[PDB]
Amino acid sequence: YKSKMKVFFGEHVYGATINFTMENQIHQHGKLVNDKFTRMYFKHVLFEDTFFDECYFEDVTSTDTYFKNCTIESTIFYNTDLYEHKFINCRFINSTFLEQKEGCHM
Amino acid sequence: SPFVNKQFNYKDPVNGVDIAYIKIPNAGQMQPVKAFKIHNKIWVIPERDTFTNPEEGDLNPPPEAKQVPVSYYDSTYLSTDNEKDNYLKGVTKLFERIYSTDLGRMLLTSIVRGIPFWGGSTIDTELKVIDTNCINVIQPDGSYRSEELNLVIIGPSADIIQFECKSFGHEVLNLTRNGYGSTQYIRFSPDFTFGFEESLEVDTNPLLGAGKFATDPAVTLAHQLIHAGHRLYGIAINPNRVFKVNTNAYYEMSGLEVSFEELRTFGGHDAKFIDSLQENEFRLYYYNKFKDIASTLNKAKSIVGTTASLQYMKNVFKEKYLLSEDTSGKFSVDKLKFDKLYKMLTEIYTEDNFVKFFKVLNAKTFLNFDKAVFKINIVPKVNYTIYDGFNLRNTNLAANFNGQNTEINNMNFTKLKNFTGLFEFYKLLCVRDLCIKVNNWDLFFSPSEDNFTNDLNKGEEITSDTNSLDLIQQYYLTFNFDNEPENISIENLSSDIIGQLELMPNIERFPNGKKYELDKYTMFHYLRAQEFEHGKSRIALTNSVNEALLNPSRVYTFFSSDYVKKVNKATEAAMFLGWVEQLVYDFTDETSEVSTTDKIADITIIIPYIGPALNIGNMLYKDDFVGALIFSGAVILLEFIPEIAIPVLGTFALVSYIANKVLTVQTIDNALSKRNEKWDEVYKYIVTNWLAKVNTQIDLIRKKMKEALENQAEATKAIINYQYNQYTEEEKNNINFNIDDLSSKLNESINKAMININKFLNQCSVSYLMNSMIPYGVKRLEDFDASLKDALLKYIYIGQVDRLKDKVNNTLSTDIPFQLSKYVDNQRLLSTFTEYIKNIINTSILNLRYESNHLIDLSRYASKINIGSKVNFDPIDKNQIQLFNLESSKIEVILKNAIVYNSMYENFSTSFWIRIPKYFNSISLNNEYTIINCMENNSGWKVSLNYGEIIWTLQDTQEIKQRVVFKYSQMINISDYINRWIFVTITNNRLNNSKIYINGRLIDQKPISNLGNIHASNNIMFKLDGCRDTHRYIWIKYFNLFDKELNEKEIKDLYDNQSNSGILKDFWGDYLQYDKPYYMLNLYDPNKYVDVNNVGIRGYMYLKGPRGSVMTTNIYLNSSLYRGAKFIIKKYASGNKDNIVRNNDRVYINVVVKNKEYRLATNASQAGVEKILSALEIPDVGNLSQVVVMKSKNITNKCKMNLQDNNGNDIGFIGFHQFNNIAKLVASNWYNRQLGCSWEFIPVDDGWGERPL
């Protein structure tokens, strides 16, 4: 598993709606602007130094994913299990945290 | 024991002791005239006065009428025996009536006792009678017996109804003003009485009709007796001391002479027109005169011209002047006894006191001029009883003074034709024609500034020792009786007593018919526009004065257009009776109207029609009149602005005694006492100025309002009568209409309106007194207090310094309250003054409020309210002011320079409602920006803000700073201070502490006593200064400043009053509104939001959580509010056209689901107390209970909804019940039996910053 780890550097993802499952990836210095994660599975994916922007998280189920040093701005986390403990040294900006799936899901 | 014993009839013989031919002094030779003595030293001569004055030898009217409002001329009066006997009986009855009263008894005893002084001897050591102060009664044997007398009563001169007290003067001595005294001849007639009109009696008898009251002759005789009593002791003021006025302007009386003697005699309200300095000067002058005559009495040791022993004469003069001998024949005056005697002769003996004792009507002030001449009969007891007068007991005249009303008691007074024409003395006013003549006695009374003088500026040095009917009753017990100067034999004088009357100053004739050209329509023009001639042709009302003055047959009216349309309409007989009733209904409606706007300070009852009634301020719109009133205070009512200027009060020079311990404490006590005396004296001077210059104009405006209302009523009555006159005989007899009942009901409506007009004018006068006159004196007094405090503290600089310093600091830190009860005795005005004092806001110093599209200082202390071009006002409620972070988004308040004192801001309070949006940018942290500034030269107080902090800063010149802060956190689930209105108040006392309260609860306090010189400022800056955040802004409203520390009770009262409990409020504290979508929040469970479930009958609504979270790291973390289904409020039965909801309104509730509206209804027939709510499509069944009554009061408990059935039965308060697992919404009656019934409406706001996904 660990051999097939995808390293991502310097991304600029604009206006993309994500519907599938992405697994075993790390993102560094990403700039996820106006994205949308709806009804998907996060599996062993790591975010570092990524700058979110007005992204929308809906019915996203996460496992072993962890946000680090990310600037998260103007986002909405509705119906999710991405609890507080999944965020490490992250700065929120004008963000929100609405209904959140109860219990972790795998 | 009656005054006059053994009634004299007229034709009794010429005996020589009680009824005899006498020869009074005269210029030449006079035939002896029959005169009757009625008591000791009192004679009556029932003849016309053609003897004393040689000029007054004729009884015909003069070619040039006098400057007199009412006068009757006659020639056949008192020429027949019956007339003389009737005159005698009337005079005797009036004397007995005066004598019965305790005050009258004292007056008559004093007049009888006070014989004229014997100063006719050229040599200084002799006493000789004045040759002109005695009469000659000729005995039937043939010789005369010269006798000394005090009073003489003579029938009037050519002018029948002109009563005056004359005296016989001396060659070198002014007997009537140097204490010697002289005989007084009164020209009085009881058969005639002036008639006045009273319009301030309705407060006791609302059923009273018109005025036209007749003056009781007893009061007039008492006035003349008071004049004689003043002149008998020689303490009368010189006639040239006259109350001068101004006559140049068009609104001023052409001429009205009123001497200081008349002001003293009138007493009561009139006597206050002379300041205390002139009273002091007169008292000192007459004390010196009494000392001089006492010394003259002491020096003399021989008497020539009489048999009686000298010692008896010295005793007589000692008991007259209350001199104090000391068992060595050394007469001397004492200040206490002479002060008592002067106060009795000046203040106790007054016409107002006689009016109070007699309990009769009279003109409360000399301005209420007489109007008619009434011939009356006094001799019969059936018309005038000795004890009561015209107000006979046990009859219809007993109550409401109906005995003095000529329109009830018609048979007792006969109206006579007075010779002074209505337009004999007039002023001719007109605009740039239509020139109208206005009678001189119908113009404003404007006293000049010369009559008021002050000794305030002069300084004072302090040393070791520097210092009501019950009162009349106490004087009555203290008074001395049983000692009346016995008759003395005087050697007879010459047959002809040569003597000339006291010389009077020449009064120049005021010019008549002055022509004035103006540029506006004055109030006299409007009054003369409403008059008419009772002509034969029809009279139509109109609303254009330019045509009413021009056309005689059309009268101006200030009522609505509907009324003038109605009264101009030709109506048949079949509708005449209904027409009249409609007309009286419209009369009552228009006259009883009042103004709703009350935010004004104690001008609560504003009468609108007054504007068009007199053209007040030169606008002809009632709405414009109310706007101008609120904008400019009570100034617009005044025709001329009084000029009041208090000089800089003098300093107190304190003497120091070497090595003394008790006297210095006495000096400190004396300084504090004299401080209180200075405060009282300045207050009294200001009250006197206000009474003389302001209240008179208000009284005139009141009288003119009454006259205008009477004119309108008479015009309507004339129109009705003319329409009635046109019918045929069968029409008149079948349709009967009478005039008396119509007149009575119109008069009652006029009285009902007049009560409100009087209340409004009293409020205006008191408001002007407390707003524009008192502060100009308070500034001087408190500046003087500050100046004296430093001198006192330097003076303390043995062994008692701490207590004395505490005493002086606490004494001079505060101020003496102004209570009107110690300066005026008018009940009607004192009640309104107490109402003024009651409200705390009325006593505020700065009262910035938005009124009539203008931001104005309702307390009238501010000179300039400067407004920037980038300051926003909320359209729904214009009071809320929004200030941005721009250089041009500022407000400036510039106070009046002559009201602000240097030592202000020592004890003061401030209060304002502020709304502060959430802090978003991280720059806001550790950033303090001033939002209110009052600092100059780095000194004063400023209100600043910071991240979750409200700071109050007080700084002095020495750079010392004291801060009180209120800190509220932003990291909370639900905050009561973030983007919500909060009522901040701050109270500073220099002595102890400075405190800050938030929402009426004490929050913080800190000492400020260490501060030095906090030098006061003049500008107030509402501007965000120093804020690094670029989009920062605040909301501020209801700013108020107070000149005294506020306790907790006053703070809570302010919070309750300014909260405006009548209007329901949303979450942020704004006004709840119709047709606006609000999210719902429950206070019982604030962690869950309202959601809907299958809209329809079978669905419901429940509460589910958690709400969520809205966060910005290191800045804030608050639970989201824009969640759930939004509620909107649709009107149902609110008649108000605005969308603002109020208490007890009935409303419909709509819930939005999928951007579609569903009515909030339920079926009340389901079992159990709980009635689960539901959402139904708006085309639902009306049988389901849906109407919701909104309430905000029980004490106020948030905003509650009460579901009601269609039949008025109360389904109950809205709320939530945990019906099984799902917590549904229910209309429960358990909540009606007082939580969970309190709700909060959260609308989308731009200060919260949450995005409604």
Ligand SMILES: *[C@@H]1O[C@H](CO)[C@@H](O)[C@H](O)[C@H]1NC(C)=O
């Ligand atoms: C991918 O996105 C499309 C577009 O909305 C959607 O039709 C599809 O269902 C998504 N894929 C899955 C596995 O749901």
